[PDB]
Amino acid sequence: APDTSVSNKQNFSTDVIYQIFTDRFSDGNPANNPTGAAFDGTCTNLRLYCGGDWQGIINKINDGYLTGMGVTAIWISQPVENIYSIINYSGVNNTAYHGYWARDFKKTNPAYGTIADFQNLIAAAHAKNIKVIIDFAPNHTSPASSDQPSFAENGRLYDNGTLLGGYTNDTQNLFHHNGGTDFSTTENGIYKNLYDLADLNHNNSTVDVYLKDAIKMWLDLGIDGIRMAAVKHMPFGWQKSFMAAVNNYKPVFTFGAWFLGVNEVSPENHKFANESGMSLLDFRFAQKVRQVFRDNTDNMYGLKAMLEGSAADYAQVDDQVTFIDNHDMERFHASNANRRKLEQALAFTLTSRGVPAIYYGTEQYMSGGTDPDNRARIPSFSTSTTAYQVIQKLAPLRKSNPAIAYGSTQERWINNDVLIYERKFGSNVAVVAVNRNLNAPASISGLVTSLPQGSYNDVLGGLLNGNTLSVGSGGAASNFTLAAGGTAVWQYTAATATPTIGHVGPMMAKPGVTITIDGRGFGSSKGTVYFGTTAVSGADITSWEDTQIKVKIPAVAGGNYNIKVANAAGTASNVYDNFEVLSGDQVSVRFVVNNATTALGQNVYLTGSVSELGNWDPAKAIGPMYNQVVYQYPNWYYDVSVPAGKTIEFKFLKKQGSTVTWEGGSNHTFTAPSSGTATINVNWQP
Ligand SMILES: OC[C@H]1O[C@H](O[C@H]2[C@H](O)[C@@H](O)[C@@H](O[C@H]3[C@H](O)[C@@H](O)[C@@H](O[C@H]4[C@H](O)[C@@H](O)[C@@H](O[C@H]5[C@H](O)[C@@H](O)[C@@H](O[C@H]6[C@H](O)[C@@H](O)[C@H](O)O[C@@H]6CO)O[C@@H]5CO)O[C@@H]4CO)O[C@@H]3CO)O[C@@H]2CO)[C@H](O)[C@@H](O)[C@@H]1O
Ligand SMILES: OC[C@H]1O[C@H](O[C@H]2[C@H](O)[C@@H](O)[C@@H](O[C@H]3[C@H](O)[C@@H](O)[C@@H](O[C@H]4[C@H](O)[C@@H](O)[C@@H](O)O[C@@H]4CO)O[C@@H]3CO)O[C@@H]2CO)[C@H](O)[C@@H](O)[C@@H]1O
Ligand SMILES: OC[C@H]1O[C@H](O[C@H]2[C@H](O)[C@@H](O)[C@@H](O[C@H]3[C@H](O)[C@@H](O)[C@@H](O)O[C@@H]3CO)O[C@@H]2CO)[C@H](O)[C@@H](O)[C@@H]1O
Ligand SMILES: OC[C@H]1O[C@H](O[C@H]2[C@H](O)[C@@H](O)[C@@H](O[C@H]3[C@H](O)[C@@H](O)[C@@H](O)O[C@@H]3CO)O[C@@H]2CO)[C@H](O)[C@@H](O)[C@@H]1O
Ligand SMILES: [Ca+2]
Ligand SMILES: [Ca+2]
Ligand SMILES: [Ca+2]
Incomplete structure (x- = not known):
């Protein structure tokens, strides 16, 4: 299979994603439409179900609407079962039409369809060489109150029908009970309720295994990608362990939604995208694009700056999902605006680096303010628009x-x-x-x-x-x-005569796992693959052709490796650095260090004997650790993905810039759980 094959669940760079807001795309089966106050067939109230479903998408796929546009992948709303209640927010009825209020990750939203429907959807998609990406919000369930089990559905979590527990009387501790966040700090937005959404507790084995197990199902259902919601409100350590679960099972292109405001350039964001095991939605790119083509708050120079910077700040920039707007922001097109502005922002995006994602209806010149104004039902499926023709002419480029x-x-x-x-x-x-x-x-x-x-x-x-x-x-x-x-x-x-690597995925996994290496000039006759100095050839190289190569990760020590290949002739290719060989199966472990006083600017970090811990390298140390929500200074904590079952030696550090002060005494020792989570609590050694 060539790099461009719809079978390529690891590379979307050659694809053009079409972000589909199910409920507002097409109602192919009204028999599943909700009833009463939770529904509005006219789609006048954008806070209620309009009828959009999976069958609607299948029809759109078959009727050549998407295909004719050059779309090769779709990003659909969370397929999991959502709450049924109609949250009345100050005389304003709200429904889970957006699918972000999950109640059972193992089940599907009856409004979108059934497992069978979902299966038919995937089947239809692949039949039309269309990849299927599904939203995933494992950060929470739904809105809920601790003192009012009556409100909403109490954020109740279900495991394929079986009640796991709710926010009220959560003696199980499946959720966080630290109130809501004010987005003041990263840790703040993590261990606190995203708005009023019941914040799950990934440090809880049940919740941890359940979630990982849930993704397995959808992964078995044939999904080709995963869009992770609120990746900024979940512990970074756990998400890696989650990516590890995926990659060490059925690796599929994954990217998280990490909001970046105007003129915002985060190093944490860059780091996350660089070591989380997943990419990210290029908000930096989108915001700049908008500043330049929509708001006029910046010129070509700012654009160029964004391009160069991003290309250097992102280890795998081509894995960043680009866009000009989405369900979380005002539609790029303004009713009064000059269409050419959108078409231009489109052309630019469709020809830039990364994975272009197009918000449904963009090609129809839909305008609208903040949610839900930006989630209006697609006016029509006209192929007569100029935007449509643009996408249609540019999209195929990503493949040719x-x-x-x-x-x-x-x-x-x-x-x-x-x-x-x-x-x-x-x-x-x-x-x-x-x-x-x-x-x-x-x-x-x-x-x-x-x-x-x-x-x-x-x-x-x-x-x-x-x-x-x-x-x-x-x-x-x-x-x-x-x-x-x-x-x-x-x-x-x-x-292309010489071997050239254009992409590699996944970028983080344990040996024995099959990574995909795309590019050109690989040649028809199998060659060699290098994981640093380690050479891999023959058998462990499952498949090999000119644009795609499948190979098993060698049994090498955990750490970062520079991928490279050589044609059957020996001709070596460029290098695709930053590959991560895990130490093995992963598990989210929470490290806690006490009595670690510090001074302003001084932050505690964690080092250890495993690559997942930086292998004693302070530069690759874990942190900075937290000390506000779960644990309070001088108590520091942090969730880290470590090799399960392994006995690791670790030490804590005190960082100030790059200046490091090591912990005293001897190394702390512990043995990672074989599965589930664990909490290693040790005291700072003078
Ligand atoms: O002790 C009381 C109470 O405190 C805490 O809860 C309060 C909360 O902390 C506080 O902020 C406030 O919350 C209200 C908020 O301020 C309002 O803005 C409003 O929120 C609406 C959103 O503004 C609006 O955009 C939309 O939000 C939902 C999105 O529509 C939906 O798509 C989904 O968003 C997803 C993004 O689209 C997606 O890209 C991304 O990946 O994931 C996102 C999250 O899943 O979800 C959004 C949230 O549902 O509708 C919102 C309407 O509810 O209302 C907020 C509720 O009042 O008040 C809270 C209550 O006081 C504690 O957390 C709580 O336990 C405690 O009871
Ligand atoms: O915006 C959030 C902040 O996050 C990061 O701040 C870190 C600091 O860099 C760490 O030094 C630490 O702060 C400790 C501090 O070390 C400790 O002395 C104590 O601070 C007292 C201080 O002694 C006293 O003089 C006065 O200033 O009150 C302080 C509060 O008690 O406690 C601090 C922890 O609260 O941890 C924070 C993270 O919580 C980041 O570096 C900052 O830029 C940022 O402001
Ligand atoms: O002496 C060779 C010269 O080549 C390179 O310059 C290129 C510029 O980097 C590039 O921007 C472009 O320049 C155009 C400007 O962008 C535009 O504003 C206007 O001034 O016209 C210019 C083209 O004449 O093209 C040139 C190459 O033609 C290199 O970067 C320089 O360092 C070097 O001096
Ligand atoms: O580099 C591998 C090595 O790293 C870790 O050792 C660190 C010590 O834990 C830490 O105390 C510090 O050691 C210094 C001593 O404190 C000091 O008395 C004197 O002995 O010099 C030491 C400097 O090397 O720094 C080292 C790392 O620099 C880890 O604990 C070891 O297991 C690991 O082998
Ligand atoms: Ca329907
Ligand atoms: Ca959270
Ligand atoms: Ca790179």
Whole structure:
């Protein structure tokens, strides 16, 4: 199977995701529609079920709506069973139409469909080479009150019909009872209730195993991706252990939703995306895009900055899910706005690095403010829109031109409003020119690219006022005029002689697990695969062709390895660093250190004898540890993914910048549980 195959559950870079808000997409089966006050067939009240279901999606898949657009993957709402109550928030009735109020992760939302329906959906999708990504909010269940078991459904958690427990009288401790968060701090937003949502307690073995077990089911149902909701409100350590469970079972492309406000650039975010075991939704990208094309709060320069920075801050930038809007923010298009702004933001996104995600209805020019105003039912399924044609013309590129999927990003021409960038990958190139200035044209001279000499027509067919590019010798493009609001796309594709790695997934797993290595120039005859200095060939290399290679992770020590391959001839390829070989099966372990006083700026960290602990390396130490919610200073705590069953030696550190002060005495010792969670409580040694 080629990298572009719908079977590629590890790489979406060649795909164009279509974010589908089920309830608001299409009602293929009204027999499952909810009744009474929880439903509004007219979709006037955006806080109630409108009827959108899985069958609706199947129909959309079969009727060529999505396919005709060039969509190769969908991102659907959480499939799990949600609460049935109609939460009345100050005289305002609310329903779980959004599917974020789960009540049983092992069951499905009868409103969307049945297991069978879901199965038919996946079947339909794959039949149309369409990948299926499902939302997953294992951070909570539903709204609930501790003193009012009457409100909502008390956040009651079910395990395939069997009541596990509720928020009230939670003597089991399945949830956190630290009130709500004010998003003041990361730890704050983690161990506190996301709004009024019953915050699950992943430190609880039951909850931990149940959740992991639940994902297994959906994984067995054939899903091709996982969009993790509120990845910022869940302990980072546990999520890794969760990614480990997935990857060590049935690895599938996963990305979390980590909100990033305007002009917000988080290192924690970069780190999470770099070591969580999952990617992230490129909010930084989206916000900048909006600032540049929608709000005009920044120019091409800010865009370029975002591009370069992100390409350096993200270990695997091509794994970041890009977008221009979503269900959590005002639709990119404003009723009064100039359509070209959206079309441009679209063209840009569809040709940039990462995995482009398109919010349903965007191609219909839907406008709307904050939720639920941004979740209106798709006005129509018209293929006549310009946005539709844009996507339609650009999307396929992600499959025909590896430069777009895995290529690099280099600015070739730039100014306040004009931006001309190039994507390169092997013998493939893509030059994109965007003139956001809707009132002024731009004289493009001195443009240099990697495009071989030749005449290049606009792949957009002048759709966005594009033009033909004339490339002479040296990649020098003859002077040309870039129409106002003009957007062109020139490309070059050719066979790649030398082995080039464009993607690798998953990026974190234990030996014996099969990773997927995509790119071009691998050759038909099997070659060699390197996990650092360790060479792997023959049998452990399940499959090998030109664009895709399947191989089992060698039994090497835990840690980061630099992947690389060599054709049957010995010709070595580029390097795809940052691969993580786990020490084995993982389990979320909570470490607690007491009496660890410190001074402002000084934060406690954790080090240990395993790669999951940094192998005694302070730079790779775990932390900074928390000390506010669950435990209070001088008491520090933190949930960490450690190799299960293993006997690990660990020590605590006191960090100040990169200056480290080691713990005294001897190493602490403990043996990781074989499964479930555990709490290692030790005192700081002077
Ligand atoms: O002791 C009292 C009480 O305290 C705590 O609870 C209070 C809470 O701390 C406090 O903030 C407040 O909460 C209210 C909030 O301030 C209001 O904004 C409102 O919330 C509405 C949201 O603004 C609105 O966007 C929407 O939110 C839901 C989304 O529609 C839905 O899609 C989903 O959001 C998901 C994102 O879309 C998705 O991308 C992402 O992946 O995951 C998100 C989360 O799943 O979920 C959103 C939340 O349901 O509707 C909201 C309407 O409810 O109402 C809040 C409730 O009043 O008051 C709280 C009560 O005082 C404690 O936590 C609590 O235990 C305690 O009783
Ligand atoms: O925004 C949240 C903050 O998060 C991070 O802060 C860390 C600090 O870097 C740590 O030093 C630690 O803070 C301890 C502090 O070490 C300790 O001395 C004590 O501070 C007292 C202080 O002695 C007293 O003079 C006065 O300042 O009151 C303080 C409160 O008692 O307690 C602190 C813990 O509350 O932990 C925090 C995280 O909680 C981050 O580095 C900061 O930028 C950020 O503000
Ligand atoms: O001496 C060679 C020269 O080449 C490289 O410059 C390129 C710029 O980096 C690139 O931005 C582009 O420049 C255009 C500007 O963006 C635009 O504002 C306007 O001024 O036209 C310019 C083209 O004439 O192209 C040039 C290459 O042509 C390299 O970065 C330089 O360091 C180097 O001096
Ligand atoms: O590097 C591997 C090694 O790391 C860990 O050892 C650290 C000690 O725990 C820590 O106390 C500190 O040791 C210094 C002593 O305190 C000091 O008295 C004198 O002996 O110098 C030491 C400096 O090396 O730092 C080391 C790491 O630098 C871990 O505990 C070991 O098990 C592990 O082998
Ligand atoms: Ca229905
Ligand atoms: Ca949480
Ligand atoms: Ca990298």
